[PDB]
Design an enzyme around this catalytic site. Structure first.
Site, PDB file in Angstrom:
ATOM      1  N   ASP A  58      30.183  44.577  31.847  1.00 13.80           N
ATOM      2  CA  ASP A  58      30.054  46.358  31.810  1.00 13.80           C
ATOM      3  C   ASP A  58      31.743  45.979  31.964  1.00 13.80           C
ATOM      4  OD1 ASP A  58      28.610  48.186  32.998  1.00 13.80           O
ATOM      5  OD2 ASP A  58      30.636  48.634  34.778  1.00 13.80           O
ATOM      6  N   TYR A  65      39.142  52.106  33.465  1.00  6.82           N
ATOM      7  CA  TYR A  65      39.092  50.648  34.038  1.00  6.82           C
ATOM      8  C   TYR A  65      40.482  50.316  33.879  1.00  6.82           C
ATOM      9  CZ  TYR A  65      34.755  50.549  35.769  1.00  6.82           C
ATOM     10  OH  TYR A  65      33.275  50.607  36.323  1.00  6.82           O
TER      11      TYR A  65
HETATM   12  N1  LIG Z   1      29.102  53.437  36.994  1.00  5.40           N
HETATM   13  C1  LIG Z   1      30.514  53.403  38.486  1.00  5.40           C
HETATM   14  O1  LIG Z   1      30.944  54.778  38.840  1.00  5.40           O
HETATM   15  C2  LIG Z   1      30.409  51.890  38.759  1.00  5.40           C
HETATM   16  C3  LIG Z   1      31.854  52.091  39.842  1.00  5.40           C
HETATM   17  C4  LIG Z   1      32.236  50.819  41.453  1.00  5.40           C
HETATM   18  C5  LIG Z   1      31.045  49.974  40.266  1.00  5.40           C
HETATM   19  N2  LIG Z   1      30.470  49.755  38.812  1.00  5.40           N
HETATM   20  C6  LIG Z   1      31.130  48.953  37.864  1.00  5.40           C
HETATM   21  O2  LIG Z   1      30.449  47.428  38.534  1.00  5.40           O
HETATM   22  C7  LIG Z   1      30.825  46.169  39.416  1.00  5.40           C
HETATM   23  C8  LIG Z   1      31.156  45.949  40.073  1.00  5.40           C
HETATM   24  O3  LIG Z   1      31.079  46.627  41.741  1.00  5.40           O
HETATM   25  P1  LIG Z   1      32.695  46.042  42.244  1.00  5.40           P
HETATM   26  O4  LIG Z   1      33.755  46.039  41.114  1.00  5.40           O
HETATM   27  O5  LIG Z   1      32.671  48.013  42.763  1.00  5.40           O
HETATM   28  O6  LIG Z   1      32.368  45.197  43.300  1.00  5.40           O
HETATM   29  P2  LIG Z   1      31.414  44.050  43.893  1.00  5.40           P
HETATM   30  O7  LIG Z   1      30.741  43.494  42.262  1.00  5.40           O
HETATM   31  O8  LIG Z   1      30.592  44.650  44.761  1.00  5.40           O
HETATM   32  O9  LIG Z   1      32.936  42.623  44.490  1.00  5.40           O
HETATM   33  C9  LIG Z   1      33.621  42.320  43.974  1.00  5.40           C
HETATM   34  C10 LIG Z   1      34.527  41.938  44.854  1.00  5.40           C
HETATM   35  O10 LIG Z   1      34.021  40.681  45.572  1.00  5.40           O
HETATM   36  C11 LIG Z   1      34.237  39.722  45.338  1.00  5.40           C
HETATM   37  N3  LIG Z   1      33.396  38.768  44.368  1.00  5.40           N
HETATM   38  C12 LIG Z   1      32.746  37.876  43.224  1.00  5.40           C
HETATM   39  N4  LIG Z   1      32.026  37.868  43.934  1.00  5.40           N
HETATM   40  C13 LIG Z   1      32.214  36.568  44.563  1.00  5.40           C
HETATM   41  C14 LIG Z   1      31.864  36.128  45.395  1.00  5.40           C
HETATM   42  N5  LIG Z   1      31.175  35.122  44.846  1.00  5.40           N
HETATM   43  N6  LIG Z   1      31.646  35.250  46.983  1.00  5.40           N
HETATM   44  C15 LIG Z   1      33.458  36.565  47.315  1.00  5.40           C
HETATM   45  N7  LIG Z   1      33.455  36.851  46.431  1.00  5.40           N
HETATM   46  C16 LIG Z   1      33.185  37.260  45.918  1.00  5.40           C
HETATM   47  C17 LIG Z   1      36.000  39.988  43.614  1.00  5.40           C
HETATM   48  O11 LIG Z   1      36.719  38.573  44.610  1.00  5.40           O
HETATM   49  P3  LIG Z   1      37.431  38.536  42.847  1.00  5.40           P
HETATM   50  O12 LIG Z   1      37.141  39.472  41.618  1.00  5.40           O
HETATM   51  O13 LIG Z   1      38.891  37.956  43.125  1.00  5.40           O
HETATM   52  O14 LIG Z   1      36.639  36.523  42.724  1.00  5.40           O
HETATM   53  C18 LIG Z   1      36.403  41.778  44.612  1.00  5.40           C
HETATM   54  O15 LIG Z   1      36.898  41.797  44.951  1.00  5.40           O
HETATM   55  C19 LIG Z   1      32.445  47.180  39.055  1.00  5.40           C
HETATM   56  O16 LIG Z   1      33.564  46.025  38.529  1.00  5.40           O
HETATM   57  C20 LIG Z   1      32.268  47.895  37.743  1.00  5.40           C
HETATM   58  O17 LIG Z   1      31.741  46.844  36.194  1.00  5.40           O
HETATM   59  C21 LIG Z   1      30.669  51.016  39.006  1.00  5.40           C
HETATM   60  C1  LIG Z   2      34.518  55.710  42.200  1.00  8.66           C
HETATM   61  C2  LIG Z   2      35.703  55.376  41.378  1.00  8.66           C
HETATM   62  C3  LIG Z   2      35.359  54.000  40.410  1.00  8.66           C
HETATM   63  C4  LIG Z   2      34.715  53.173  39.923  1.00  8.66           C
HETATM   64  C5  LIG Z   2      34.071  52.894  38.838  1.00  8.66           C
HETATM   65  O1  LIG Z   2      33.748  53.682  37.900  1.00  8.66           O
HETATM   66  O2  LIG Z   2      33.749  51.650  38.683  1.00  8.66           O
HETATM   67  C6  LIG Z   2      37.545  54.062  40.020  1.00  8.66           C
HETATM   68  C7  LIG Z   2      37.534  53.374  38.957  1.00  8.66           C
HETATM   69  C8  LIG Z   2      38.850  53.559  38.247  1.00  8.66           C
HETATM   70  F1  LIG Z   2      39.147  52.862  37.103  1.00  8.66           F
HETATM   71  C9  LIG Z   2      39.917  54.651  38.485  1.00  8.66           C
HETATM   72  C10 LIG Z   2      39.188  54.797  39.517  1.00  8.66           C
HETATM   73  C11 LIG Z   2      38.264  55.272  40.108  1.00  8.66           C
HETATM   74  C12 LIG Z   2      37.438  55.415  41.859  1.00  8.66           C
HETATM   75  C13 LIG Z   2      36.941  56.596  42.664  1.00  8.66           C
HETATM   76  C14 LIG Z   2      38.447  57.439  42.390  1.00  8.66           C
HETATM   77  C15 LIG Z   2      40.000  56.405  42.742  1.00  8.66           C
HETATM   78  C16 LIG Z   2      40.717  57.611  42.813  1.00  8.66           C
HETATM   79  C17 LIG Z   2      41.242  59.051  42.672  1.00  8.66           C
HETATM   80  S1  LIG Z   2      42.741  59.666  43.039  1.00  8.66           S
HETATM   81  C18 LIG Z   2      42.615  61.422  42.215  1.00  8.66           C
HETATM   82  O3  LIG Z   2      42.665  60.381  44.367  1.00  8.66           O
HETATM   83  C19 LIG Z   2      39.748  59.873  42.924  1.00  8.66           C
HETATM   84  C20 LIG Z   2      38.802  58.739  42.333  1.00  8.66           C
END
Ligand SMILES: NC(=O)c1ccc[n+]([C@@H]2O[C@H](COP(=O)([O-])OP(=O)(O)OC[C@H]3O[C@@H](n4cnc5c(N)ncnc54)[C@H](OP(=O)(O)O)[C@@H]3O)[C@@H](O)[C@H]2O)c1
Ligand SMILES: CC1=C(CC(=O)O)c2cc(F)ccc2/C1=C\c1ccc([S@@](C)=O)cc1
Length: 315
Positions: A43, A48
């Site tokens: 993803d 990013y």
């Molecule tokens: N569409 C959207 O708007 C949106 C928004 C948010 C997220 N996403 C996608 O969803 C992905 C996952 O969400 P997220 O990055 O917000 O957070 P997450 O996957 O919920 O958590 C990531 C965190 O957990 C840690 N971690 C991972 N595996 C672990 C394990 N086995 N034990 C302990 N800690 C662990 C990682 O540390 P380390 O990396 O240091 O190991 C990192 O600090 C994102 O990277 C992105 O690709 C999409």
């Molecule tokens: C929710 C969020 C995500 C998550 C995602 O898509 O995986 C993100 C990822 C990025 F690379 C940059 C910003 C954001 C964000 C919210 C956000 C951050 C700063 C601002 S500043 C304008 O204050 C505003 C909104």
């Protein structure tokens, strides 16, 4: 059972690697390790700022013949400043260029909110509010459909859309390709039952983002809770001889969701994949669902006045 059939006819791996916040100097090795240990879904997103480095990894594993392109499922997302119909293709092509790909498996509208185009990802005015664009979901969708017809993407979908916004697309005059996926925040503190049931009833696959509660999100506060440290979830993991993260990853899988935990740590990348050798009971699933607090870690708080802000609605 490792892939789910989408409404475009393609099979999507139910476990993928997230890449938000993965530093550019660490993400190439993260994706390389992930592919080596069995991940087939990555993803990504333009916003990013690491797609070039993700792409280096993918290309090296293709060159090494660790995997074939048809075995990978690469996802990226159209950023908010590119919602105008005339900007969508170029945004996709920048992502393809950085990822070293000639097509994406899935391309998502990252948020329903369009922002003023320009170099700034979050163009701001004086009140702390985002500067919108006069774009609408339906015209951006038509531009996404053109990407399918031009062969740049195999599937299109949406992210952070509420059920009324999904319904808008489903009701679009002349709809050509239905959304394949809605990618939304989902974890035991934000269980999403209503939106998931809506999407699944329409044949739209839901991908759960931030399944571990995004503890590395830059706006985390010390008082915020921590899924990984919840002693109730720890207890379920102990019963199964698994880690809390492994339970948090298996949970959405058993709801027929796709899940995309992020790590840059090789040991954790491998740990997070080792979730196909145990099953949570129905009782455990219901218990995890009972932890819902309607707690959202990605609330897009700078855009709460945007006409298309998704989180005023109940679901
Ligand atoms: N569409 C959207 O708007 C949106 C928004 C948010 C997220 N996403 C996608 O969803 C992905 C996952 O969400 P997220 O990055 O917000 O957070 P997450 O996957 O919920 O958590 C990531 C965190 O957990 C840690 N971690 C991972 N595996 C672990 C394990 N086995 N034990 C302990 N800690 C662990 C990682 O540390 P380390 O990396 O240091 O190991 C990192 O600090 C994102 O990277 C992105 O690709 C999409
Ligand atoms: C929710 C969020 C995500 C998550 C995602 O898509 O995986 C993100 C990822 C990025 F690379 C940059 C910003 C954001 C964000 C919210 C956000 C951050 C700063 C601002 S500043 C304008 O204050 C505003 C909104």
């Amino acid at each position: 059972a490792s892939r789910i059939l989408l409404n475009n006819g393609a099979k999507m791996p139910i476990l993928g690697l997230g890449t938000w916040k993965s530093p550019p100097g660490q993400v190439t090795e993260a994706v390389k390790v992930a592919i080596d240990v069995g991940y087939r879904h990555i993803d990504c997103a333009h916003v990013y700022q690491n797609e070039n480095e993700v792409g280096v990894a993918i290309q090296e594993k293709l060159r090494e013949q660790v995997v074939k392109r048809e075995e990978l499922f690469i996802v990226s997302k159209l950023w908010c400043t590119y919602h105008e119909k005339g900007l969508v293709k170029g945004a996709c092509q920048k992502t393809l260029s950085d990822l070293k790909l000639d097509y994406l498996d899935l391309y998502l509208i990252h948020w329903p909110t369009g922002f003023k185009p320009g170099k700034e990802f979050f163009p701001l005015d004086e009140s702390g509010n985002v500067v919108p664009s006069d774009t609408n979901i339906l015209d951006t969708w038509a531009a996404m459909e053109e990407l399918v017809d031009e062969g740049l993407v195999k599937a299109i979908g949406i992210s952070n859309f509420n059920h009324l916004q999904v319904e808008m697309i489903l009701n679009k005059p002349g709809l050509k390709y239905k959304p394949a996926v809605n990618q939304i925040e989902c974890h035991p503190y934000l269980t999403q039952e209503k939106l998931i049931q809506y999407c699944q009833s329409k044949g739209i696959v839901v991908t759960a983002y931030s399944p571990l509660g995004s503890p590395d999100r830059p706006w985390a506060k010390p008082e915020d809770p921590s899924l990984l440290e919840d002693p109730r979830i720890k207890a379920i993991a102990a019963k199964h001889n698994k880690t809390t993260a492994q339970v948090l990853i298996r949970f959405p899988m058993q709801r027929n969701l796709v899940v995309i935990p992020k790590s840059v740590t090789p040991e954790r990348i491998a740990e997070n994949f080792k979730v196909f050798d145990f099953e949570l009971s129905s009782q455990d699933m219901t218990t995890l669902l009972s932890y819902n607090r309607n707690w959202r870690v990605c609330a897009l708080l700078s855009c709460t006045s945007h006409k298309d802000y998704p989180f005023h609605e109940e679901f």
